[PDB]
């Protein structure tokens, strides 16, 4: 009942600022780095495929992980424990029924015990103050998709795809809020499939002009062109499925003609 469509979008915009992580964080982390964060998120993309989890669960786990490394220093040998815990929590929050704890343990090849997983869950919950209802790029896109004229399935998948790529790279994407990245990916997917542009609807909905989206969008264009090269590739492999009309294939526009 879109008598709340407005309020929800307004409220998610209010909550995305509150669920934001420390931008700098990776700098002040003496043992972990962006590239390792990259491997972990890429890994969670596949743990997701293995257990046929919602993309939202995957987005939620990344938010938890960043917010957690924002306050806690983690050694590289325990990184996979944080993430593993965050996916369980995310799974419990978002999925109809989560995977058993024992499966999350299995996928690690016993680098952690069941109890160690549960203990970290608990710690992740203390540090996060049970604030698990974090808005995500995937939540903003979904809200944005209602404003397409009309819904182009290829545009939805590809926007979704670009949104995930942004999860992998703290590198630039930690500097934008989820709604902005969402905006950028939608403009980029639309632009890639049809040549059209950030619709007026959305400009009016988001308060965002194309120009406001331009920095993140240039970054996201770079990421799209560079994607076949990246060290991490689970996302592209995920998006080769008929499920997403294989959008992962279409050729990125070499210029944004912006």
């Amino acid at each position: 009942v879109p008598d709340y469509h407005e309020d929800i979008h307004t409220y998610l915009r209010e909550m995305e600022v509150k669920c934001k992580p420390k931008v700098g964080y990776m700098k002040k982390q003496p043992d972990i780095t962006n590239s390792m964060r990259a491997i972990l998120v890429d890994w969670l993309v596949e743990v997701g495929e293995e257990y046929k989890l919602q993309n939202e669960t995957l987005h939620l786990a990344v938010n938890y992980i960043d917010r957690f490394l924002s306050s806690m220093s983690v050694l590289r040998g325990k990184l996979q424990l944080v993430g593993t815990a965050a996916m369980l929590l995310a799974s419990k929050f978002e999925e109809i029924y989560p995977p058993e704890v024992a499966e999350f343990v299995y996928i690690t090849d016993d680098t952690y015990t069941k109890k160690q997983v549960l203990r970290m869950e608990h710690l992740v919950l203390k540090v996060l103050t049970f604030d698990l209802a974090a808005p995500t790029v995937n939540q903003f896109l979904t809200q944005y998709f209602l404003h397409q004229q009309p819904a182009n399935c290829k545009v939805e998948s590809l926007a979704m795809f670009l949104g995930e790529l942004s999860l992998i790279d703290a590198d630039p994407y930690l500097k934008y809020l989820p709604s902005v990245i969402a905006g950028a990916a939608f403009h980029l997917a639309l632009y890639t499939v049809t040549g059209q542009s950030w619709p007026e609807s959305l400009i009016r909905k988001t308060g965002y002009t194309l120009e406001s989206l331009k920095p993140c969008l240039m970054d996201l264009h770079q990421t799209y062109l560079k994607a076949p090269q990246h060290a991490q590739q689970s996302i592209r492999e995920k998006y080769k499925n008929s499920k997403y009309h294989g959008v992962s294939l279409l050729n990125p526009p070499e210029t944004l003609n912006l």
């Binding site: 491997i39 990184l79 996979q80 680098t111």
Partner: peptide, 5 residues
């Protein structure tokens, strides 16, 4: 898999 970091 154990994550190689």
């Amino acid at each position: 898999r154990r994550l190689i970091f």
